[PDB]
Every structure is written in structure tokens, then in C-alpha cells.
Coordinates of C-alpha atoms and ligand atoms in Angstrom, one line a residue:
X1 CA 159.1 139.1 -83.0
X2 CA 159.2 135.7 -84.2
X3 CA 158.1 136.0 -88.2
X4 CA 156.0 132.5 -88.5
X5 CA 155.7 130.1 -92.3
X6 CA 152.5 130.1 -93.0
X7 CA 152.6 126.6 -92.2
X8 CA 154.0 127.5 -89.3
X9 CA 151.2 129.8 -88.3
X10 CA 148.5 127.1 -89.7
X11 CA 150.1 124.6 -87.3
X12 CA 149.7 127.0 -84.2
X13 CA 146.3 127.7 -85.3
X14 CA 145.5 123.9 -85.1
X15 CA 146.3 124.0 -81.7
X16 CA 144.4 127.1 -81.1
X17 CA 141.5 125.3 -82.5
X18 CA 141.9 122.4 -80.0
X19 CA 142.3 119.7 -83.1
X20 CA 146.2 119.6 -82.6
X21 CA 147.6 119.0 -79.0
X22 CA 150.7 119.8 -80.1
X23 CA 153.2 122.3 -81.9
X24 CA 157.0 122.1 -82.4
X25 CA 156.5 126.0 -83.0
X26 CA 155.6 126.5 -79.0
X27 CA 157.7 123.7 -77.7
X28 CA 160.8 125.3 -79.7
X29 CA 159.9 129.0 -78.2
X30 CA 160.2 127.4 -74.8
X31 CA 156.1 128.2 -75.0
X32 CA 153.4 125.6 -73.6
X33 CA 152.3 123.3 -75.8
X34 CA 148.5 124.1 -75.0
X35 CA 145.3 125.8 -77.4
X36 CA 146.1 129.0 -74.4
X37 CA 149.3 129.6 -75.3
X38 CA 149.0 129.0 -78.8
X39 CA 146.2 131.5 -78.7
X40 CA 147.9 134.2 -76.9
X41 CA 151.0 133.9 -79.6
X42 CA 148.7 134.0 -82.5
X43 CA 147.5 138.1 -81.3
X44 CA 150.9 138.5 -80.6
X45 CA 151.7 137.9 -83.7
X46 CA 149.0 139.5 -85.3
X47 CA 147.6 136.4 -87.2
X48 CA 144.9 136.8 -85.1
X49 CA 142.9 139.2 -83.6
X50 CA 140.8 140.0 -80.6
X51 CA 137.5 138.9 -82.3
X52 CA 138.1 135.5 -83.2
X53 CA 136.9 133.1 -80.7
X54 CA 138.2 129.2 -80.7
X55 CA 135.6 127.5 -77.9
X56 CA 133.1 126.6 -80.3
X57 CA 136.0 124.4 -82.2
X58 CA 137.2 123.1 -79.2
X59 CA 134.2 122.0 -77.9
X60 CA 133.4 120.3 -81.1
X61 CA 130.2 122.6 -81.8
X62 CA 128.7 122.7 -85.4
X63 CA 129.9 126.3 -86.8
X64 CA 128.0 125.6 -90.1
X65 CA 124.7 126.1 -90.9
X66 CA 122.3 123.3 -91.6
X67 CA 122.2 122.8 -95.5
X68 CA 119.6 120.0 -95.9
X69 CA 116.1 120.6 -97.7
X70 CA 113.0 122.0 -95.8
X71 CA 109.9 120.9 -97.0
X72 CA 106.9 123.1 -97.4
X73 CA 103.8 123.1 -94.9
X74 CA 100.7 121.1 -96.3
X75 CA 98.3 123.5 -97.5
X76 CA 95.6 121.2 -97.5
X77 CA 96.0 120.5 -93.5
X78 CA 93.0 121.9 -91.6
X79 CA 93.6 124.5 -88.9
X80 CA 91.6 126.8 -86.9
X81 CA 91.8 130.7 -88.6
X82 CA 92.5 132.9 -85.8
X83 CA 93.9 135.4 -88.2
X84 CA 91.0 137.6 -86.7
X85 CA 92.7 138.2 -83.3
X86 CA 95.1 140.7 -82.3
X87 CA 98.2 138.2 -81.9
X88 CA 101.6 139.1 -81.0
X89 CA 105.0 137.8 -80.7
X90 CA 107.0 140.0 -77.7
X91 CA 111.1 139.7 -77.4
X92 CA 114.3 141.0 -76.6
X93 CA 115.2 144.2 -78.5
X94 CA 117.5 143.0 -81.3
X95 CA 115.8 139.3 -81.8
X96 CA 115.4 138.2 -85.1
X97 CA 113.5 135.1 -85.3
X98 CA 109.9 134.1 -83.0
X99 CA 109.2 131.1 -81.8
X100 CA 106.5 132.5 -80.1
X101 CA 103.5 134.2 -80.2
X102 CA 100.7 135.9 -77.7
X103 CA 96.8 136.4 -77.5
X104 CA 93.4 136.1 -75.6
X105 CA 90.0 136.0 -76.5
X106 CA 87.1 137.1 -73.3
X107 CA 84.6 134.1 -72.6
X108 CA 82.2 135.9 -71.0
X109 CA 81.5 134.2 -67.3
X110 CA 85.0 136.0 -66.1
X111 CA 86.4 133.3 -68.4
X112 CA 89.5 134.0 -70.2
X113 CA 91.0 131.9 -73.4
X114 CA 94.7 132.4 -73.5
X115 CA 96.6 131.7 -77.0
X116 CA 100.2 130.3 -76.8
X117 CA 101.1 130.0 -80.6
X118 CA 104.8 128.6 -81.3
X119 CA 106.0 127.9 -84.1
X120 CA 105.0 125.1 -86.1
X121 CA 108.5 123.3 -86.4
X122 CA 107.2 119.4 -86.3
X123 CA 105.2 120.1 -89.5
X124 CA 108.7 119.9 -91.4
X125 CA 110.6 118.4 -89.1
X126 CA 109.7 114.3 -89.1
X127 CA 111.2 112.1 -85.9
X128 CA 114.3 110.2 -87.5
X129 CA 114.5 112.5 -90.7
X130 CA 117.6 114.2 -91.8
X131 CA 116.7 117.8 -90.3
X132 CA 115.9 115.8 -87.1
X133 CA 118.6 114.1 -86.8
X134 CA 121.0 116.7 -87.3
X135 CA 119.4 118.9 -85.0
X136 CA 119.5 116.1 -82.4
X137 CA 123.5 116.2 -83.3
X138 CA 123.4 120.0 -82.3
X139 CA 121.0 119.9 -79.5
X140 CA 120.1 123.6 -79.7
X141 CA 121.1 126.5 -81.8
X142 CA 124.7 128.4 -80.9
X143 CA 124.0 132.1 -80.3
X144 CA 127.1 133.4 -80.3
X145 CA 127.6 137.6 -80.2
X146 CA 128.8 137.6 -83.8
X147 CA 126.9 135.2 -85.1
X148 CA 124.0 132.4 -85.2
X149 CA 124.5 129.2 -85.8
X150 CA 121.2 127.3 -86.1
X151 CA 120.0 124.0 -85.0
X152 CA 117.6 123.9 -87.9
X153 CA 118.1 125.5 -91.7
X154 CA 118.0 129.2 -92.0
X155 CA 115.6 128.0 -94.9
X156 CA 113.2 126.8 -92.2
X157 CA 113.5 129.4 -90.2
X158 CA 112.5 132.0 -92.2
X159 CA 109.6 130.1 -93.4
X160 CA 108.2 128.8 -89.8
X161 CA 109.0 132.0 -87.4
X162 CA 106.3 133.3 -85.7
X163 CA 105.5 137.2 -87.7
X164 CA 108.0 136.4 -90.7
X165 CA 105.3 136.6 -92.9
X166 CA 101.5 138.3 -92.8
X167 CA 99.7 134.8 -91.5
X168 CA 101.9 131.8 -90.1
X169 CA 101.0 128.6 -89.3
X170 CA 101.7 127.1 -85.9
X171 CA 100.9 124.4 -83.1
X172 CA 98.8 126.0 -80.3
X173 CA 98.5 125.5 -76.9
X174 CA 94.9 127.0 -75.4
X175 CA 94.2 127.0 -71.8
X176 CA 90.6 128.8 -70.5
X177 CA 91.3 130.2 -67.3
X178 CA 89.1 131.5 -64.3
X179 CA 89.4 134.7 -62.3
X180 CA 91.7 132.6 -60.2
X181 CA 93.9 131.4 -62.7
X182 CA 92.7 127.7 -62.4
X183 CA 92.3 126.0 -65.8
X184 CA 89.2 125.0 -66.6
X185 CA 90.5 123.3 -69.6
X186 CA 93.3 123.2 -72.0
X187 CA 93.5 122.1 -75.8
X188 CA 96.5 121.8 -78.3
X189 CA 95.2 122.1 -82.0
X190 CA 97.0 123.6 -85.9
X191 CA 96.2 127.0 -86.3
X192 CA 96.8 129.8 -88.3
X193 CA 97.7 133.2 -86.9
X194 CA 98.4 137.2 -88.0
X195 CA 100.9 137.8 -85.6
X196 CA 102.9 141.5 -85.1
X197 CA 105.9 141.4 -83.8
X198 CA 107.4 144.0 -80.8
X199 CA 109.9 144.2 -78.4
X200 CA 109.3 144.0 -74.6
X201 CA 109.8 147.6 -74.1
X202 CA 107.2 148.4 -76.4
X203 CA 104.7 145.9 -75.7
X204 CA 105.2 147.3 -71.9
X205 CA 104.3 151.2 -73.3
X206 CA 101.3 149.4 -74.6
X207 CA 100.2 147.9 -71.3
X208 CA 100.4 151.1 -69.5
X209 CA 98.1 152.7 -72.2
X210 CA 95.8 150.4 -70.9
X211 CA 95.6 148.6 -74.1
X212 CA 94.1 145.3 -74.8
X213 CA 95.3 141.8 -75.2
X214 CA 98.3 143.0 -73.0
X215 CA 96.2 144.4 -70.1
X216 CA 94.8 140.9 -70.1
X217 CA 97.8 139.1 -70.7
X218 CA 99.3 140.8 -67.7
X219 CA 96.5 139.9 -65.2
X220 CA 96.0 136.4 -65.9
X221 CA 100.1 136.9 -65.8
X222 CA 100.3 138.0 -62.4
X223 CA 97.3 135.6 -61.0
X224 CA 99.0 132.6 -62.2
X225 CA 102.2 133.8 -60.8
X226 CA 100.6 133.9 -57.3
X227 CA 99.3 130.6 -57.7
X228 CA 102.7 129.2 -58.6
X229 CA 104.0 131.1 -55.7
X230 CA 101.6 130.0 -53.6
X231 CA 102.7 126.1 -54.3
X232 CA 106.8 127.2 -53.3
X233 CA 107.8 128.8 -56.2
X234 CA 111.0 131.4 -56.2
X235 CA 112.8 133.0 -58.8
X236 CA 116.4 133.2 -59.9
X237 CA 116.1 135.9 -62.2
X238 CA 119.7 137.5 -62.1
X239 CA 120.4 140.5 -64.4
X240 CA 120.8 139.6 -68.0
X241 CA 122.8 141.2 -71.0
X242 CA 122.8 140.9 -75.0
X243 CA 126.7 140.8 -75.6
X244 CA 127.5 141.7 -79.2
X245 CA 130.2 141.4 -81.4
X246 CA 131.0 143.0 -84.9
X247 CA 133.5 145.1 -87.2
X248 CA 132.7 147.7 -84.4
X249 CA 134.1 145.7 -81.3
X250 CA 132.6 144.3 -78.4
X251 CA 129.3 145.5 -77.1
X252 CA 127.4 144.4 -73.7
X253 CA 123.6 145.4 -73.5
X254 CA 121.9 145.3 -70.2
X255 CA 118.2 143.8 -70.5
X256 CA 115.6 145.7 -69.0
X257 CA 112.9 143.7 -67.0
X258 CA 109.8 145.3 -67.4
X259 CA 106.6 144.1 -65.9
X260 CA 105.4 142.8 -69.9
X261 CA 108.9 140.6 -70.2
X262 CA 107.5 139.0 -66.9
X263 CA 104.5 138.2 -68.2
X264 CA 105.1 136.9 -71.9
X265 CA 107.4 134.3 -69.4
X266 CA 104.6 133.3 -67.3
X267 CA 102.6 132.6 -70.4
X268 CA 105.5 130.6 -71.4
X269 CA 105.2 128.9 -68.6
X270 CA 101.8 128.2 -68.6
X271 CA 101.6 127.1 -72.4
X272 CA 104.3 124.1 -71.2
X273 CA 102.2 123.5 -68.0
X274 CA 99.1 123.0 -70.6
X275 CA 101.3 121.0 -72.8
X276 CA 102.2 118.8 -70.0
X277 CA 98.6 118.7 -69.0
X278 CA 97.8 117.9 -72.1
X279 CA 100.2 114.8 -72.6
X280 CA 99.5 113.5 -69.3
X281 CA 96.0 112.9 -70.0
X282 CA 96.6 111.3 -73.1
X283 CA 99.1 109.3 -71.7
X284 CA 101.8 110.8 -74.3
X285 CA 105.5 110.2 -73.9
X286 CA 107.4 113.9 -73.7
X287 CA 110.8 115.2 -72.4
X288 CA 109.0 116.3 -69.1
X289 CA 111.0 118.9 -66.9
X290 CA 111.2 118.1 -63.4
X291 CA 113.5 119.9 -60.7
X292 CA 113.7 117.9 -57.3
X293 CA 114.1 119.9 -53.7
X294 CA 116.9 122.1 -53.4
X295 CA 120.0 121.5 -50.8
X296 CA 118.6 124.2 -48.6
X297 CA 115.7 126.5 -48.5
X298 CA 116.7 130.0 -49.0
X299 CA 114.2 132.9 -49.0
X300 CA 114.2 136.0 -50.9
X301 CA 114.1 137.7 -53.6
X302 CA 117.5 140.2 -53.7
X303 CA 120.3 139.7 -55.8
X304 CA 122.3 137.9 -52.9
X305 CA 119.1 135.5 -52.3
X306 CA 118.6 134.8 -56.0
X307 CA 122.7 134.0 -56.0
X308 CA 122.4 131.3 -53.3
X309 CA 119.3 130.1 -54.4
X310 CA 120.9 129.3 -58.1
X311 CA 123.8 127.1 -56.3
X312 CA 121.5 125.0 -54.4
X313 CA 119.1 124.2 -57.1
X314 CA 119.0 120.4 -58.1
X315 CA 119.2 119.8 -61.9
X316 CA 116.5 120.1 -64.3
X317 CA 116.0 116.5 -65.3
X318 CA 114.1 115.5 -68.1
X319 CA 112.3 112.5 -68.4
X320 CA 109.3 110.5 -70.0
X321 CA 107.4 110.6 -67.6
X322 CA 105.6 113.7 -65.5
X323 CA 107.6 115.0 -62.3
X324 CA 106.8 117.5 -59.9
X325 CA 109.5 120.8 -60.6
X326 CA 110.2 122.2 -57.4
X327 CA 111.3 125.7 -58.6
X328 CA 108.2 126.6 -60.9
X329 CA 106.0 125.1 -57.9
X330 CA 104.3 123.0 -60.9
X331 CA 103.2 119.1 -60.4
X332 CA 104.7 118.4 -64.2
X333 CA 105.3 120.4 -66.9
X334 CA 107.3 120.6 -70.1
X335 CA 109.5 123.2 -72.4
X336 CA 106.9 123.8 -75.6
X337 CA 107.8 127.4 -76.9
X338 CA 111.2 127.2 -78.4
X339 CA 111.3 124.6 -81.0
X340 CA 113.6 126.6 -83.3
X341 CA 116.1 126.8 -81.2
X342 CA 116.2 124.0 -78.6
X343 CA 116.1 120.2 -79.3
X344 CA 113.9 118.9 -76.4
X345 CA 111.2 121.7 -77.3
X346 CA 111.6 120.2 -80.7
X347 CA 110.2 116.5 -79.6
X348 CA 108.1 117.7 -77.9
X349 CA 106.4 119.3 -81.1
X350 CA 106.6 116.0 -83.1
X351 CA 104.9 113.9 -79.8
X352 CA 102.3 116.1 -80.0
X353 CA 101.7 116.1 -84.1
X354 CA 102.1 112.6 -84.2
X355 CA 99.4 112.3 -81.7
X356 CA 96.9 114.9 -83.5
X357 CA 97.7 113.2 -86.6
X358 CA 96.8 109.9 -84.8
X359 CA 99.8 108.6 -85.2
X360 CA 101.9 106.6 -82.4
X361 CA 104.2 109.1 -80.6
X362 CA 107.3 107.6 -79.6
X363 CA 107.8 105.1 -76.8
X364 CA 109.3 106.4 -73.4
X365 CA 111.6 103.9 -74.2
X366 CA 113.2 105.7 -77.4
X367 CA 112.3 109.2 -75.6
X368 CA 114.8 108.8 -72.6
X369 CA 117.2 107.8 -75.7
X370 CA 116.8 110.4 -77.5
X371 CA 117.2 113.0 -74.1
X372 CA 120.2 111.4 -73.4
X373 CA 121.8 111.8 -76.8
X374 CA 120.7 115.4 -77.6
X375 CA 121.6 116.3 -74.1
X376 CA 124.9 115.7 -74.6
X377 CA 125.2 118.0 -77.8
X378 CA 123.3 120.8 -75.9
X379 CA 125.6 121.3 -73.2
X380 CA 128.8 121.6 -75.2
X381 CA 127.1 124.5 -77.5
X382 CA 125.5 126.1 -74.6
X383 CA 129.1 125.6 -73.1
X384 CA 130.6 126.9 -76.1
X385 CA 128.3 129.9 -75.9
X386 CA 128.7 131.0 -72.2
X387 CA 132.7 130.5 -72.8
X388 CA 132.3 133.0 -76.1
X389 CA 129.7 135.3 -74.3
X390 CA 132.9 136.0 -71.9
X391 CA 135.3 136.2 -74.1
X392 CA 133.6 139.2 -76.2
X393 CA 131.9 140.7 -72.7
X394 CA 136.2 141.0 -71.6
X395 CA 137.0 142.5 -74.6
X396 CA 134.0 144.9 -74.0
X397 CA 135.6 145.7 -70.5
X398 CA 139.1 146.2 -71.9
X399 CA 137.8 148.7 -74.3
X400 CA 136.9 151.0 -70.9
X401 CA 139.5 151.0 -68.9
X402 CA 138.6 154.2 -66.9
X403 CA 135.2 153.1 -66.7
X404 CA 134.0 152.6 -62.7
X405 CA 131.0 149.4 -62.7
X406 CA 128.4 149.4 -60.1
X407 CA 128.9 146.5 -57.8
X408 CA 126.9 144.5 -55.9
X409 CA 128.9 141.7 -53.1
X410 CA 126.4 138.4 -53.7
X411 CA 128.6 136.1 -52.2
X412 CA 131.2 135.5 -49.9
X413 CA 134.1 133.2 -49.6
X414 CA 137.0 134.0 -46.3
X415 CA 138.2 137.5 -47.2
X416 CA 136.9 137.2 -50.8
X417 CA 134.0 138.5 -52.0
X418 CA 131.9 137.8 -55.2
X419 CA 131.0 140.4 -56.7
X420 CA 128.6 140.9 -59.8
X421 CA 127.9 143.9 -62.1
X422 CA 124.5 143.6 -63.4
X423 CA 125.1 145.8 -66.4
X424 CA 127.4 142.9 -67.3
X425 CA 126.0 139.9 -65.7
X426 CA 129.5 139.4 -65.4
X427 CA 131.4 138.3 -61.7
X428 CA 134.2 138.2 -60.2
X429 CA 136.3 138.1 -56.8
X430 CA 137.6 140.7 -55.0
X431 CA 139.3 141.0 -51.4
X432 CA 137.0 143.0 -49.6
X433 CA 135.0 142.4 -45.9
X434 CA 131.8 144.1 -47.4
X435 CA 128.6 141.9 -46.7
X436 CA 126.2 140.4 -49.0
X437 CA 124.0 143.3 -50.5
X438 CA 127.1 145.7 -50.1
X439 CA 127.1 148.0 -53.0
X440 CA 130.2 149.1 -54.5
X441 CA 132.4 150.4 -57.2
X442 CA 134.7 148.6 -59.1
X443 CA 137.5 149.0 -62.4
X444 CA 138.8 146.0 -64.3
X445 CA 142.4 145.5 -65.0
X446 CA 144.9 143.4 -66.8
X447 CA 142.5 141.4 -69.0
X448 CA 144.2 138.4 -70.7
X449 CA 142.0 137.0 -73.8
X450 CA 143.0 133.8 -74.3
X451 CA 142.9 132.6 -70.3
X452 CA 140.1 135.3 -70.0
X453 CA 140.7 136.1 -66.6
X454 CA 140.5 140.2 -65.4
X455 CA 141.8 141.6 -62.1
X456 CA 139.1 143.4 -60.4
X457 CA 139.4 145.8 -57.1
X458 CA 136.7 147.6 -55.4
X459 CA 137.9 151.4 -55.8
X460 CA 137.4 154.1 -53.7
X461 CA 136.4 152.3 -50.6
Ligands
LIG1 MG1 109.6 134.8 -78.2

């Protein structure tokens, strides 16, 4: 009812925003001065609507895009033409830009040569130059449903990622493994690659043609895996969405897990083992991921074991030095297959370049510096995100309100239950004395945006 200035409207929005902490507009309405109730007036009064989303401003995250130059890759570099193998770069449906690609190549002996190709990110991206440090400012790129938000220039993205173009250059990792899965040796060299691009779905239609590299990919996949296993290894791998956002509304996407999405992550995983292995024995300085022992062991691998499990993980800790990581059931290891998109993968590309180029990588001195300070950027956009991945995920379940979820009770707390819906990887709590593995149905109710809480109740019970 109230018909807000402009100014007026502007000066609610700055507390929307988070960069006012105050407004005469809400204190005179006998409304809270706070960015919530400045938000809920603003749809209210139809200055804004549901779309808009003000976390990433609160939090401070970067909303523009990177506008500095990219520089070109050297021509005149040597690297090793693989152009001749069949190499591939497997994601979620709706990705838009590889960091990563896929291959293998028989040694004869029962030997196999696995290819972990990333992009090659260090090649333009100098420690200490602008694009560096602005992407140490960021700490990793905002994915947010209705838009991207890179760490890097789109520029540079479309010219490094994986597929973009018919041959790409990247940074390699190579590790030859037995029947077994044990390495028998690992190398990281500059190559050059013909990489195709599909999604996990289709990659997964290949693999049960029976067609090669991903019939190999998936049993030196599933050896490894048993390996890792066998050293105390255990998953968390909770349901997952793509949550979208455009002049359509809301949309929430479960992701499928087929067997191929398991394996193109425990290549992942092996090309940051090799990495590690790599920098260990040449005594180079990287952001190595560690993971101490959890609070308590749980075993299992159901939804309800997976849920515990998460809460009594330690933190991933990165540090310059090799660790043991107690939930990948590896001795050391180290992120190397998202450099586009994450800041520590990043470093780990230029440690690496500036030691093939014979150069001196940086000291473990400067490298637990630079953790700390990229760290700190990381988790406010990665908070940022999560906050916005709600927001539009509510707005989804608004949209449906006679639509009945399938349930599942993961964890309990007195006479309140937590329960998740895997088509949303979305939970909440509901009064009910189901146990832990209980399936049930429930409907969503009351959703309020801008404290983006829902009232949920198991129905039909
Ligand atoms: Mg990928």
C-alpha cells in the first residue's frame, strides 16, 4: 500500500543489498530495520520480484565479470601431440565450459596409460599477475542458477576449455597402471589434445555398448576404487541437483549417477593423487588436501549413513606440505582438475609450470599465504552460492504446491526428524517418530523468500 520515492525505494534496496544497515523508510513503517525485512517489502511492493537474489551482495562476492586481458598460448612451446587418441571431456548435462578431459592408451604387459588432460590455465595465468590476483580475490567462480560469474575472464575461458575448439592445449597428468591399479609411474607434461565433449548420460550409453576408452576408463575406475577402499575409504555421495533460474521461473534438476559419472570422479581422483605424487618427489610446494580422522566411525553406505558420516568429517585442510586424507583413503593428494573454476586448483597449475619450465615454484612459505588469503574469498562465494541455490530451489517448490515429494528420515533430533528429498537435495524438519531410512511423503507450505524458510509435514501418514 505504501507508494515509495524512488529514493525512497533505492534507500530500501541498499539495505536489501546489505551496504546500508539502516532505513528511515522501515523504522517509520514500524518495520525492522534489517536486509530481511527490507527484502520482503521490496516484493510487496513490487519493486522487486521473486528472481532477484541479494546474498552475493551481502556477502561481498564479485558479481562482475573479470575484464582484464588474456594473453594468448605460446605457439612455439613444445608439447606432446596426442591429437591421435580418442579423448574426451564427460559432464553434467547442461555444462558449458571443461576443465577436464579423458583417455587411455593399452601398454601391452596388462599395462594401462591413463590421460587426465585439464585445462591449461597456468599458461596465461602468471603467479602475482593481474588475472591471478584477481582470481585469488574471488577464490573460485560463483555458479549461481541464473548466472556465472567467473573467477577468470570469459575471454580465457573460451580460449582454454577443454573441447572449445578442434585441438586444445593442456597440462597433463599420466599415470601407467597395473591390473591392480598400482602405479607403476606417473608423469605431468604440455600436451595437445582433440577432445569431444559428452554428457555423463551419454558417455554411460557408450560404456554399455561396450565401447572403448570408456570400457577401460571404467575398469581401471572400479580397481582403483577398491584400492582406496581397501585403505578406509567411504563416500558421502548425497543426491545432487542443477537448480536453475530464468525468465521461465525456478527449475530443480535431479542428477543422475550413473556408473560413467563415478568413474570420470575416480580419474579425478587419481590425476590429483599423480599430481601429488608427482610434487612430492620433486619436493614441490602445492596446496596439498588432507582430511584428518573423523569424530566417529560410521559404516555404510545408505542415505542415513552417508548423512552422519558428512557431520563428523574433519575439515579438508590445505597445506604445503603432503598429508594423509582420511576420507579418500589416500597418503597425500591434491585438487588438479578444475583450474577454471577454483583458486587452489589454479596454484597448483602454476607450481607445476614453473617447475617444468625450470623455474622456482613458490616457497611453502608464500603458499600457506596464499591458502589463507584465497580461502577466505572461496567460502563467501561458495556461501553466497549454497544461500542463492535455496533461494531459487524454494521458489521452485512454491511453484507446486500440490506436489507430494518423496522423503527419506536421515536424521533425528527428539521428536524431530530430518528429512531430505533427493529430487531436491533439499532438507528440512518435520515432527514425526519415523526412524532413519523411513521413507515418506511430504508437501511444502508457507514459503517466505526473503527468510527462506518452508513448513514441511509428512502427509498421509
Ligand atoms: Mg569436467
Amino acid at each position: 500500500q505504501p507508494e515509495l520515492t524512488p529514493a525512497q525505494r533505492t534507500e530500501v534496496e541498499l539495505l536489501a543489498r546489505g551496504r546500508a544497515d539502516k532505513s528511515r523508510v522501515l523504522r517509520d513503517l514500524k518495520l525492522p530495520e534489517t536486509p530481511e525485512a527490507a527484502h520482503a517489502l521490496l516484493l510487496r511492493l513490487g519493486v522487486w520480484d521473486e528472481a532477484r537474489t541479494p546474498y552475493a551482495d551481502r556477502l561481498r562476492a564479485a558479481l562482475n565479470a573479470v575484464e582484464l586481458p588474456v594473453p594468448d598460448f605460446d605457439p612455439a612451446e613444445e608439447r606432446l601431440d596426442l591429437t591421435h587418441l580418442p579423448t574426451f571431456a564427460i559432464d553434467d548435462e547442461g555444462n558449458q565450459d571443461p576443465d577436464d578431459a579423458v583417455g587411455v592408451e593399452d601398454l601391452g604387459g596388462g599395462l594401462t596409460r591413463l590421460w587426465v588432460h585439464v585445462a591449461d590455465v597456468a599458461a596465461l595465468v602468471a603467479p602475482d599477475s593481474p588475472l591471478d590476483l584477481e582470481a585469488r580475490a574471488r577464490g573460485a567462480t560463483l555458479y549461481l542458477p541464473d548466472r556465472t560469474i567467473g573467477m577468470l575472464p570469459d575471454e580465457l575461458v573460451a580460449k582454454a576449455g577443454l573441447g572449445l575448439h578442434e585441438v586444445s592445449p593442456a597440462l597433463s597428468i599420466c599415470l601407467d597402471l597395473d591390473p591392480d591399479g598400482n602405479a607403476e609411474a606417473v608423469d605431468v607434461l604440455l600436451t595437445r589434445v582433440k577432445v569431444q565433449r559428452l554428457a555423463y548420460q551419454e558417455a554411460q550409453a557408450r560404456l554399455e555398448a561396450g565401447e572403448e576408452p570408456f570400457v577401460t576408463l571404467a575398469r581401471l575406475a572400479r580397481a582403483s576404487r577398491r584400492l582406496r577402499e581397501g585403505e578406509g575409504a567411504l563416500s558421502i555421495d548425497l543426491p545432487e541437483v542443477r537448480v536453475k533460474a530464468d525468465e521461465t521461473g525456478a527449475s530443480v534438476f535431479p542428477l543422475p549417477k550413473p556408473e560413467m559419472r563415478t568413474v570420470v570422479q575416480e580419474c579425478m581422483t587419481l590425476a590429483g593423487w599423480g599430481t601429488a605424487i608427482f610434487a612430492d618427489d620433486n619436493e614441490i610446494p602445492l596446496p596439498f588436501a588432507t582430511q584428518d580422522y573423523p569424530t566417529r566411525e560410521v559404516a555404510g553406505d545408505t542415505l542415513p549413513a552417508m548423512w552422519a558420516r558428512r557431520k563428523t568429517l574433519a575439515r579438508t585442510r590445505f597445506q604445503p606440505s603432503p598429508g594423509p586424507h582420511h576420507g579418500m583413503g589416500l597418503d597425500l593428494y591434491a585438487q588438479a582438475t578444475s583450474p577454471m573454476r577454483r583458486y587452489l586448483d589454479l596454484v597448483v597449475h602454476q607450481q607445476l609450470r614453473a617447475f617444468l619450465a625450470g623455474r622456482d615454484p613458490l616457497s611453502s612459505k608464500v603458499m600457506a599465504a596464499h591458502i589463507a588469503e584465497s580461502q577466505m574469498n572461496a567460502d563467501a562465494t561458495r556461501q553466497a552460492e549454497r544461500l542463492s541455490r535455496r533461494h531459487h530451489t524454494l521458489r521452485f517448490i512454491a511453484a507446486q504446491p500440490e506436489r507430494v515429494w518423496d522423503a527419506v528420515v536421515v536424521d533425528r533430533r527428539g521428536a524431530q526428524a530430518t528429512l531430505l528429498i533427493p529430487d531436491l537435495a533439499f532438507d528440512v524438519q518435520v515432527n514425526t517418530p519415523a526412524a532413519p531410512g523411513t521413507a515418506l511423503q511430504v508437501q511444502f507450505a508457507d514459503i517466505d523468500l526473503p527468510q527462506m524458510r518452508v513448513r514441511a509435514r509428512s502427509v498421509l501418514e
